Symmetry: C3
Subunit: 413 residues, 3 copies
């Protein structure tokens, strides 16, 4: 009754026929090497070479590049005009990177009038707040997805096998099973990481980082991006100060201190993380976490008996073509690839269809294929503008790929 | 010296007497089936049938139903009355779902007076902001608790055993141990999940969702619930515009754009999750995560020797009665069930007492029972209004159950 | 080719030579005890005593003490002076714990003047909001780091070994390997935990707790610390009410309800956690989580064959001296200890260097030492003012330690 499947990564074994078991925890930032001449195959005249290599864990993050976080100074200036409307004149703050203007139009009923202006209900008094002394204070990225893997190389006799194993996965070679359990994520999807210096000097994790309502003083309030400045809103209140024969003066009741200055005063409240040999290219960040306390559990079984049974073996063949796509690249909501998967050589097949481009894969769907044609939907997260996403099974991908839409990542107002 | 205990789920075994070990990782959205005729019991004339079935992982979430998130339009209108107080008249905005009013009372010292109203320090000018064009944009739930389990069925010969195994737990039958490790939680307790459409189309995870201070423009600002509308506060400032002989006009300095419009502009900043075959009934949401990359580690040991020792075996008997309860159902703080647990047939017993109703269990306490009467406190989370929570050990529950209080889930102001 | 290393905690074994394997899941709040007389060493006349003890899991949190969260009442009062400036007089609100003042100076152009004050553009009207009826409502701590461990004691014959094992780590004695996998963290670094009563009655987890912009009504708005009060900002707007011959009155458009009152109205929206036997000393909180559903996977292997191979064995010797330090204690960003590590008796050595004081260790670096002198940097989190941080390998620490700087944990404005 059990139909064919390749979703289980592992073995059926008989322990009394196991030549060698390794079971151990290993730091993420540690590699591990083991070499031994095995005194079997009960042949004595000839021994069996055995190499096991496990590289340090590499972390891969698909990220949204957010630009440069800016520090700035708050300023306010007043501009009075005796007649006309507030549009009929330009203002000095309009030369600033970020500015917000409130206009008191057609209201100088003596109470608010300079000596030279004998008008009532005319003219305009313009109030403008602007930011200057802008300086870049760090680079920020929002995490779309996180991947954890270790390269593993196995040599049994004169046959070598190397593969990148994802965390909580197993590798199965003809006589060796290697499994990893326990890698846990300190970073989380949608975290914002901030680098006050080069990546090599470590980052800060910020759970509060403004997204939908960026107000001056919020974390991430002033961002300088490739597409120009992103300026914060000012939520305070304006008030026109007036006296006899004196020109009106603007007064603002609101926050004056920038988000960066607010964070540095309590800098030690936030979690840092350190990066060994980070690699940043476009929207991909890879690195090795140097924290020695983060450990995963490693199990190796060397078993050369005929009862050593790879649980994924099957005669099924899968042919793939990419039908359609919807959604966005570089998005935490993601894209959905619609695939046409043809099965031959089996009545049914339970397997995993992935969405991949030239660089890597971004998501995976477990599906139960029937002989002939099937439609499978795969959700991917990550990728970039030039990405042509393909349907893949193992290393076999469809001939043609499909580009996703640009993500909606913009402020309102 | 070791007293009896049933808290350890697992075995003591001798590996050289193990007939069969399976060790493998499996996607959460994958099932697994294995059938084999075992060529033992060294009897040859007769073989041993063996079935192993593992269902896809099911996720169970106890949720707080938050109602419908609403999109709306911001509006402001002015109402002047020449004499009397602002209470002495009704206003058009009072017909709206959400409205906020600020009244300028007894202040028209000429500066603020229409031509027809020759009064000073009398009358009132009422300012009112209201929301209209309300449309439902999705359904939101806050997660109280998360459970992960897989149904497992074992057939050895002509004897079958099926049980739901929780993640990071083991099942022990007479000759089979099955264990699961490594399932990790993407959703977290107190997350808010938002469904812009039917559950089958997936949800959005929102770390920022207003709870204690809902302001217009916040995520979750305007909620339409069974108990009526929940309206956001407006934190901006009002100002009475005045000119000669013209009637006063209200002006507001504050946010105008709704929370929903703010999110959609940056929709791709947030994490989505997808649901296969979701089931929603009252405050319970169950589903299968279709993400193929989420794997758990599965270990099966088939061992028929007399040294195969179930570590939970014991002669102890436990009788239960539900004494008292405090706390709330449907709450992330929870309720505390106070139980009276009588032990017989053992001098002491280390065991787990659970809080359960008709549907499921909601929490568990490990306790060291002494022969005779004991008091045990169990913290549960979840449940609903009709829940009668009982003290249980294994499948044995107390005769009577106790209802918890309603949760405090309300805005102030 | 493989150089020496002690980073792998575990064994190489032959399963057919294993006398006994235990494999089981165990609640965190449960201990486990196993005693058996092993009928080997195939000697029959003499048996082998075997004890295995596993204590309940203990949670250790390095915390930032935040003081007492305060509830308060909002108040506003007005003070008019006919002449002079607003500084020329004191005010009743200046006697309050928290107060904020806005001064309307030199503006009484008749419109705002009491009958007795015949001045224009002179005097001042001072507006002051203050908080009273302050009452402590709980104690709050921000989590810097979390550690999970179980004490384990092994007796084989007449030889005993006890050690605290960290989660996801293994202990290796001459013939026993014990490993733990699967402990997962419910609390997270940078979480804020709030205790409305004694620690024994449980805490509340709050993802939103004000850090960089504390506004009246935010969670954690009013904190009473050892260094005095920490007062919230008020972001609303002021307005001077005026009429004929009457003295001006202040009006505020802003939040009036405190953060504590706002939380209690929706108290059941937040996650609680319970503590068995908590220990608080300065900035260290230790406890046992009584939730019976949290389980870890335990594996014990008893194997007395000569092929039982501890993977960390090595002849290398390491000598340590503490060179320099930068960073802060009690910080989530942490400190960096710079160590001088001398290797002898090996050409190279892959090992872990830790940062420790008298109490415990706070971080760890995996490094590849060359024969002779090396510089290693270790990142630690936690500690306190008197901490002298040392470079350590295993139980061997440097003679002298170095104190870190105080953390920057202050509000601006
Ligand atoms: C692990 O990550 C943490 C967090 O990123 C990281 O902490 C950072 O360490 C750097 C390195 O020392 C700190 O940057 C220094 O800050 C001091 C004062 O704050 C400055 O004086 C330094 O600049 C001077 O020195 C330079 C040295 O050549 C000169 O080139 C320069 O012109 C200046 O004269 C220097 O910038 C930084 O402050 C912390 N970050 C925080 C948030 O505190 C830690 O070092 C990382 N550890 C490891 C082992 O990687
Ligand atoms: C996994 O989860 C994600 C997140 O939920 C999910 O993304 C959603 O996909 C749906 C399905 O296509 C999207 O809804 C569509 O949106 C487009 C434009 O945004 C509309 O044109 C669509 O409505 C039209 O088409 C319908 C088809 O019959 C008609 O009935 C209708 O009348 C309209 O004419 C449709 O609503 C949705 O936008 C996204 N969500 C987000 C946040 O982007 C994804 O599809 C899920 N994947 C799988 C495999 O389940
Ligand atoms: C697990 O953690 C949760 C969260 O901390 C915890 O819930 C708390 O339980 C306590 C204990 O009952 C509650 O405190 C009580 O609250 C009621 C009304 O809210 C008060 O009447 C109580 O005070 C009276 O009774 C005392 C008993 O002697 C008297 O000494 C006192 O003078 C008063 O007359 C009492 O304070 C608390 O409300 C909850 N917390 C929340 C947030 O709801 C739960 O009990 C913990 N469970 C276990 C098993 O530890």
């Amino acid at each position: 009754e059990p139909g064919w499947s390749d979703t289980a990564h592992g073995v059926g074994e008989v322990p009394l026929k196991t030549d060698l078991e390794l079971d151990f925890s290993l730091p993420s930032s540690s590699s591990y090497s083991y070499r031994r001449k095995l005194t079997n195959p009960a042949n004595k005249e000839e021994s069996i070479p055995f190499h096991f290599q496990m590289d340090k864990q590499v972390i891969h993050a698909e990220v949204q590049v957010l630009g440069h976080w800016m520090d700035a100074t708050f300023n306010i200036k007043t501009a009075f005009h005796c007649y006309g409307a507030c549009q009929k004149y330009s203002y000095p703050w309009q030369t600033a990177k970020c500015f917000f203007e409130k206009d008191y139009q057609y209201e100088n009923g003596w109470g608010c009038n300079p000596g030279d202006c004998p008008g009532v209900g005319t003219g305009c008094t313009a109030c403008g707040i602007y930011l200057d002394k802008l300086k870049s204070v760090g680079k920020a990225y929002k995490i779309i997805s996180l991947k954890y893997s270790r390269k593993v190389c196995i040599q049994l006799g004169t046959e070598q096998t190397c593969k990148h194993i994802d965390a909580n996965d197993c590798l199965v070679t003809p006589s060796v099973k290697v499994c990893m359990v326990g890698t846990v994520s300190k970073l989380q999807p949608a975290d914002t990481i901030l680098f006050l210096g080069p990546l090599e000097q470590g980052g800060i994790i910020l759970k509060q980082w403004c997204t939908t309502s960026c107000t001056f003083g919020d974390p991430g309030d002033i961002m300088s991006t490739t597409a120009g400045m992103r300026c914060p809103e000012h939520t305070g209140s304006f008030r026109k100060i007036c006296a006899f024969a004196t020109t009106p003066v603007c007064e603002y009741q609101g926050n004056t201190i920038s988000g960066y200055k607010r964070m540095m005063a309590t800098k030690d409240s936030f979690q840092s993380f350190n990066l060994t040999d980070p690699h940043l290219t476009t929207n991909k960040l890879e690195w090795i976490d140097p924290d020695g306390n983060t450990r995963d559990h490693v199990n190796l079984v060397l078993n050369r008996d005929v009862s050593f049974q790879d649980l994924s073996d099957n005669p099924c063949k899968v042919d793939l073509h990419t039908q359609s796509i919807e959604g966005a690249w570089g998005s935490g909501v993601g894209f959905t690839l619609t695939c046409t998967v043809s099965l031959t050589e089996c009545p049914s097949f339970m397997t995993s269809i992935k969405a991949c481009d030239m660089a890597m894969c971004y998501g995976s769907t477990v599906t139960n294929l029937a002989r002939g044609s099937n439609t499978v939907k795969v959700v991917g997260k990550g990728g970039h503008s030039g990405s042509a996403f393909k349907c893949c099974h193992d290393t076999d991908c469809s001939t043609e790929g499909l580009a996703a839409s640009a993500p909606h990542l913009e402020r309102v107002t």
